[PDB]
């Protein structure tokens, strides 16, 4: 172990190259400092930093043994005294997810040039999904203080090209996420429950219009919920179970929750909706925490009011904190997914706030935006790949 030598083997993948190389090196006094190898589309690259006696490195036996063995079977090898080279690359600082249906070449090219223009190095690119959407990951090394610019640059690329682009800190701490909360309406569940209750009153049109104004930040949430629930005054309480049994999970929601249990996440829901509807489901979904509002009932009939206190925008953040404290999870390790301005405060306080098919008020504040109608695209933003989900699911 006097001097360091770098051996690099490239060419068309073949059986036995890795084994052949280290057997040859063992006829010389070689100890390993670092080995990197990958095969991409049958192209092999094998990089080996070793140290050996200055005697062997300075003489032609090591080189002739390596070169003859590698060249004989079809590949190429270079050999060079390094001494100055890094031993082992540093970790990426950040990771970038690109989700599209499709992802065009132009979309990806724009990301790559956006990245380059900021002096960001691409350390790795891989696929993470081929269904329900194409998903691609770039691990990168961002110059210090450039990552605000990078998110800004990539959000434009995202809108201009019709791909989701999420930039996420790739450090040990920030990526040990352990706790996720979903908004219910238009996030975990298709549609808006309060609209399904109002349909029982022939008020769906009015309620839906107030809901869209509320979910765009156009109306104060508390006022908007009182106006909407009022249209329910007089309906019998039986209507709750009825709507409860009508609900449909967002597509990919079961996969999302099941996969997140495999990873040991605490899972909960924070809703402006109604505990009597969400609890039946949270229990069916084996959740750990429910926060919701409560409908007032008199003589088995809805009064058109809710029983305070009301979970408003600020209250959803407050439930997240409460959930994180009870679970023993620092807030930087929490995930919130929602769709409306109702969720702005909850996404800001979460470690990672995901806007799922969201109104512009939310998209503008989220750490990340998803634009396709599959809730399991959340799994890709949490470092999970399609193939891994299918492996786990197939093993049962």
Ligand X SMILES: c1ccc(-c2cnc[nH]2)cc1
Q: Known catalytic residues?
A: 183, 185
Residue number with CB closer to ligand X (64 or 113): 113
Residue 194 binding: pick among a copy of itself, Cl ion, ligand X, none (C-beta 5-8 Å cut-off by kind): ligand X
Out of 14, 45, 206, 226, point to the residue binding a copy of itself (CB under 8 A).
Answer: 45
Site string for a copy of itself, 326-365 (x = CB under 8 A): ---x---x--------------------------------
Residue 239 CB, shortest distance to Cl ion, in Å, is 11
Residues 293-352 that bind Cl ion (CB under 5 A): 294-295
Q: Of the two residues 315 and 353, which places its CB atom closer to Cl ion in the complex?
A: 315
Question: How far apart (Å, rounded) are the C-alpha atoms in residues 332 and 354?
Answer: 14
How do 289-293 and 164-169 pair as beta strands? Answer: unpaired
Taking the least distance from each CB to a copy of itself, the nearer of 34 and 190 is: 34
Interface with a copy of itself includes 127 (CB under 8 A)? yes
Considering only residues 335 to 354 of the shown chain, the ones binding Mg ion according to CB under 5 A are: 339-340
CB of 316 within 8 A of CB of 291?
yes
- Residues numbered 37 to 96 that lie near Mg ion (CB under 5 A) are none
What is the DSSP-derived secondary structure letter of residue 6?
E
Note every long-range contact of 214-218, with CB atoms under 8 Å and residues 24 or more positions apart, other chains counting. Answer: 214/340, 214/341, 214/342, 215/186, 215/339, 215/340, 215/341, 215/342, 215/359, 216/340, 216/341, 216/359, 216/360, 216/361, 217/341, 217/344, 217/359, 217/361
- Name 219's Cβ contacts closer than 8 Å, sequence gap at least 6: 210, 213
Interacting positions 94-123 with a copy of itself (CB under 8 A): 100, 102-109, 112-113, 116, 122-123
CA 331, CA 364: separation in Å to the nearest integer?
A: 21
- Residue 286 binds to a copy of itself (criterion: CB under 8 A): no
Q: Which stretch binds Cl ion (CB under 5 A): 149-157, 170-178, 272-280, 326-334?
A: 272-280
Q: Which residues of 330-367 are buried (b: 16+ CB within 10 A; e: fewer)?
A: eeebbbbbbbbbbbbbbbebbbbbbbbbbbebbbebbb
- Does residue number 3 form part of the binding site for a copy of itself (CB under 8 A)? no
List the single partner that 339 binds among Mg ion, a copy of itself, ligand X, none, CB under 5 to 8 Å by kind: Mg ion
For the record, the structure tokens of 109 come out as: 């090219």
According to the binding rule CB under 8 A, does residue 22 interact with a copy of itself? Answer: yes
> Which residues would be at the binding site for Cl ion (CB under 5 A)?
274-276, 294-295
């Amino acid at each position: 172990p006097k001097v360091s030598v770098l051996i690099t083997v490239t060419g068309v993948d073949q059986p036995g190259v890795t084994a052949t190389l280290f057997e040859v090196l063992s006829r010389h006094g070689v100890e390993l400092l670092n080995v990197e190898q990958v095969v991409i589309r049958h192209r092999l690259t094998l990089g080996v930093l070793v140290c050996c006696p200055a005697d062997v490195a300075d003489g032609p036996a090591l080189r002739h043994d390596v070169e003859a063995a590698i060249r004989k079977v079809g590949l190429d090898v270079s050999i060079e005294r390094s001494d100055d080279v890094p031993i082992i690359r540093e970790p990426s600082t950040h990771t970038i997810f690109v989700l599209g249906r499709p992802i065009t070449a132009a979309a990806f090219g724009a990301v790559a040039r956006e990245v380059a223009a900021l002096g960001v190095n691409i350390d790795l690119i891989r696929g993470v999904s081929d269904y329900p959407v194409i998903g691609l990951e770039l691990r990168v090394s961002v110059p210090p203080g450039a990552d605000e610019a990078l998110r800004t640059a990539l959000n434009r690329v995202s809108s201009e090209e019709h791909v989701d682009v999420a930039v996420e800190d790739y450090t040990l701490e920030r990526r040990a996420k352990r706790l996720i909360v979903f908004d219910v309406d238009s996030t975990l569940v298709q549609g808006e429950v309060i609209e399904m209750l109002a349909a029982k009153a022939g008020a769906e049109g009015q309620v839906a219009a107030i809901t869209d104004a509320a979910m765009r930040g156009e109306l104060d949430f508390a006022q908007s919920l009182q106006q909407r629930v009022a249209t329910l005054a007089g309906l019998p309480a039986t209507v709750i179970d009825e709507v409860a049994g009508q609900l449909e999970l967002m597509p990919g929601a079961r996969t999302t929750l099941r996969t997140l249990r495999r990873l040991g996440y605490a899972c909960g829901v924070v809703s402006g909706g109604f505990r009597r509807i969400i609890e039946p489901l949270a229990e069916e979904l084996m959740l750990d925490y429910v926060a919701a509002n409560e409908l007032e009932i008199v003589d088995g009939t809805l009064t058109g009011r809710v029983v305070g206190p009301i979970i408003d925008r600020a209250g959803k953040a407050t439930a997240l904190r409460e959930f994180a404290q009870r679970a023993g999870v620092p807030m930087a390790q929490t995930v919130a997914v929602g769709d409306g301005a109702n969720d702005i405060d909850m996404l800001a306080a979460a470690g990672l706030g995901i806007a799922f098919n969201a109104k512009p008020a939310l998209r503008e504040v989220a750490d990340a935006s998803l634009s396709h109608p599959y809730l399991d695209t959340v799994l890709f933003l949490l470092g999970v790949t399609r193939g891994e989900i299918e492996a786990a699911d197939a093993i049962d």
